Design a protein around this ligand. Structure first.
Ligand SMILES: Cc1cc2nc3c(=O)[nH]c(=O)nc-3n(C[C@H](O)[C@H](O)[C@H](O)COP(=O)(O)O)c2cc1C
Ligand SMILES: Cc1cc2nc3c(=O)[nH]c(=O)nc-3n(C[C@H](O)[C@H](O)[C@H](O)COP(=O)(O)O)c2cc1C
Ligand SMILES: O=C1C[C@@H](C(=O)O)NC(=O)N1
Ligand SMILES: O=C1C[C@@H](C(=O)O)NC(=O)N1
Lengths: 312, 313
C-alpha cells in the first residue's frame, strides 16, 4: 500500500508538504525540502522586493505550539521565480509558489510574471490572503470586499489555475460568506485552511515578558493550540466548496492528526510548526503513521475516507 | 500578601470566579459557587424564557481543553432575577448576572426589569455579546454595527454600570474597532475577554466521528487551546480601554495562568473548562498557587503587577 495521489494535473507520492514559510526561504531550504520524503513543497510567501522582516526574536516554540511574527522575510519574488523556472527538479515532486504582496497591485505584478513559468514548468500558485504579521496590514480575507477585489484582479492578470491560503474563521456567517466569495472564481482550484491563528500573545511567567519582539508580542499561533480550529475550517470549506480542493494546514504532528485532516476533507496536508521543530525527517514518520492507521482500519486509499467524517 | 480587590463599588476576597455557564445554571449550582472559596460568581447566560438548549452530547473535555455547543440552556430570566433579588447571600460574595437575549429587544426587556434589583441589591450585569452556539445567530460582537446598537439600547434602557462578555478577535483592526465602540459607552465599566473560540471541530480518530451533536460537531473551544488568544485579547483591551476594567477568561488551570492574565491586565480572573473538569475545589488551589508566585517575586498586592507585562525593546 502506498499514499500516491493525483491532483491539479500533477502526481504526488503522498499528501504531505511543508506549510508555506517553514523550511522554504533559501535555495538551501528548498533543496532540502526537495530531498525530503514530502509529496510536494511550497516556497516562502514572497514580495516584489526582498524583505528583512520584523525584528528578532520573532519565532518561539513551546510544548503546545508556536508563536511567530516573521513579517514576510524573503529573498524577493525574482529569486523564487528563478527557483521555479531554472532550479527546481520537477521529476522529484511538484512545486507551489506562495505570494503575499502588500497590495493588490503588488500581487498582480507578480502573477503576470509567474504566468509564463506556470505555463512552461507547471509550478502552482498559492495566493496568501492571510498574513497576520505585517504592521498596519490586516489579513486580507477578513475584509470580504478586499478579498473579492484581490481574487478578481489576480484571476484576470494570471488566467491560470491557482489556490488561496485562507485565515481561520470562527463564525458560521463568515464561513458562508468566505466560501461564497471563493465560489465566484473558477480559477481558484484549491483552498488552504488555515494560516496561523492571528495575534495571539505568549507571556513568560518568570521574566514577566512577552516572548517575541514585534508588535508588542502579538503573533500568529500554530501547532497543538490550533488543531480543532484548523479541522473546522477544512471541513467548513470542504462542505461549502464541493467543486474545489481543500488543503489542510494546522496542528499536524502525527499520522493521526493528518488522518483527521483528511477525514475533514483535506487533499494535501501541510506541516508547519511540527516541521520547524522536528526537521524534514518528520515526513517519513508521518507517512509511516498514516499508513499504519489506514491498515488498522482496512482503508486502501485516501479517497475511501476523505471528507467522510461522521456527524451525530 | 493579599488577593483582595475593591472595584465596581464592591469588595472581593480574591480575583477568582466561575466563567459564565459553568456551575451556575440551577439554584444548587449557585449555592455551590457561593459556598466555594471564589471571590465572586456569575449566573448562566439567560434568555427571557427557559431554554432546553441544543441536543446532547453537547460538551466534551480533553487533555487540551473543551468543546461545547450548549445552546443557552437556562432556567429563564425570571429565575435568575429571583435568585439575585431573594436568594443570593451578598454577605458571602458579589454576584454577576449574565444575559444573552437572542435579539436587542430581548436584552432590553430583561435589563428594564433587572435595573431596580441592581439598584437595590448591587447585582452586576454582564451582557453576553459572544455566544457562538445558537444556530442561525452569529456572535453579536463580530458585527460592529450590531454591537453598537445593542450597547446603545441596553445603556438607555438599563442606565446603570454594566460589563460586556466579548468574543476573541484575531486581527489588530478588530481590536481597534471593538475597543473604540466600547469606549463610546461610559456605562460599560468592565470588559470580559474572552468567550469560547467559536466553531472549532473536534474529531475522534477511532470512531471517525465528531464528538458533539449540534451543528455537525462545530462548537466553542475553551481550555489550554485558547490561553495565548485569551491573553492577547485581555491585553489588547487593557491597552485600548484605559478607563475601563478588563476581566480575564480563557485557559486558566493554575495560579501561573492567572498570574499571566493579571500581568496582561486582568482584574477578575474567570475559570471555565478547568472548573467544569476539576470542580469548585479548584479555587483554593488557584489562590494558593497565585500567592506562591507572588511570594517568590516579592509582590504584596495584585496592583503591583496588574498590566505590567514587559515588551521587548
Ligand atoms: C515560522 C513561520 C513562518 C510562516 N510563514 C508563512 C508564510 O510565508 N506564508 C504562509 O502562508 N504561511 C506562513 N506560515 C503559517 C503556516 O504556513 C501555517 O499556516 C501555520 O503555521 C499553521 O500550521 P501549523 O499548526 O502546522 O504550524 C508561517 C508559520 C510559521 C511558524
Ligand atoms: C459548558 C460551557 C458553557 C458555557 N456557557 C456560557 C454562557 O452561558 N455565557 C458565557 O458568556 N460564556 C459561556 N461559556 C464560555 C465560558 O464562559 C468561557 O468564556 C470559555 O469557556 C473560555 O474559558 P475557559 O478556557 O476557562 O473554558 C461556557 C463555556 C462552557 C465550557
Ligand atoms: O502568512 C504568514 C506570514 C508569516 C510571516 O510573518 O512571514 N507568518 C504567518 O504565520 N503567516
Ligand atoms: O456564550 C456562550 C454560550 C454557551 C452556550 O452554548 O450556552 N457556550 C459558550 O461557549 N458561550
Amino acid at each position: 500500500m502506498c499514499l500516491k495521489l493525483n491532483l491539479l494535473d500533477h502526481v504526488f507520492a503522498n499528501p504531505f508538504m511543508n506549510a508555506a514559510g517553514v523550511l522554504c526561504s533559501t535555495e538551501e531550504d528548498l533543496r532540502c525540502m526537495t530531498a525530503s520524503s514530502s509529496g510536494a513543497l511550497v516556497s516562502k510567501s514572497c514580495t516584489s522586493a526582498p524583505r528583512d522582516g520584523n525584528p528578532e526574536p520573532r519565532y518561539m516554540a513551546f510544548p503546545l505550539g508556536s508563536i511567530n511574527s516573521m513579517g514576510l522575510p524573503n529573498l524577493g519574488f525574482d529569486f523564487y521565480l528563478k527557483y521555479a523556472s531554472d532550479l527546481h527538479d520537477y521529476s522529484k515532486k511538484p512545486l507551489f509558489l506562495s505570494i503575499s504582496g502588500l497590495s493588490v497591485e503588488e500581487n498582480v505584478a507578480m502573477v503576470r510574471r509567474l504566468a509564463p513559468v506556470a505555463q512552461e514548468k507547471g509550478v502552482l500558485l498559492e495566493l496568501n490572503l492571510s498574513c497576520p504579521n505585517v504592521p498596519g496590514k490586516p489579513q486580507v480575507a477578513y475584509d470580504f470586499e478586499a478579498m473579492r477585489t484581490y481574487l478578481q484582479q489576480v484571476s484576470l492578470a494570471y488566467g491560470l489555475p491557482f489556490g488561496v491560503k485562507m485565515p481561520p474563521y470562527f463564525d458560521i456567517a463568515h464561513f458562508d460568506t468566505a466560501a461564497a466569495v471563493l465560489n465566484e472564481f473558477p480559477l481558484v482550484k484549491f483552498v488552504t485552511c488555515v494560516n496561523s491563528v492571528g495575534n495571539g500573545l505568549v507571556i513568560d511567567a518568570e521574566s514577566e515578558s512577552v516572548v517575541i519582539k514585534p508588535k508588542q508580542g502579538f503573533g500568529g499561533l500554530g501547532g497543538k493550540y490550533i488543531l480543532p480550529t484548523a479541522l473546522a475550517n477544512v471541513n467548513a470549506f470542504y462542505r461549502r466548496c464541493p467543486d474545489k480542493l481543500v488543503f489542510g494546514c494546522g496542528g499536524v504532528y502525527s499520522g493521526e492528526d493528518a488522518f483527521l485532516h483528511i477525514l475533514a476533507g483535506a487533499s494535501m496536508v501541510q506541516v508547519g510548526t511540527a516541521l520547524q521543530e522536528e526537521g524534514p525527517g518528520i515526513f517519513t514518520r508521518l507517512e509511516d503513521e498514516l499508513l499504519e492507521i489506514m491498515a488498522r482500519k482496512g482503508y486502501r486509499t485516501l479517497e475511501e475516507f476523505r471528507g467522510r467524517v461522521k456527524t451525530i
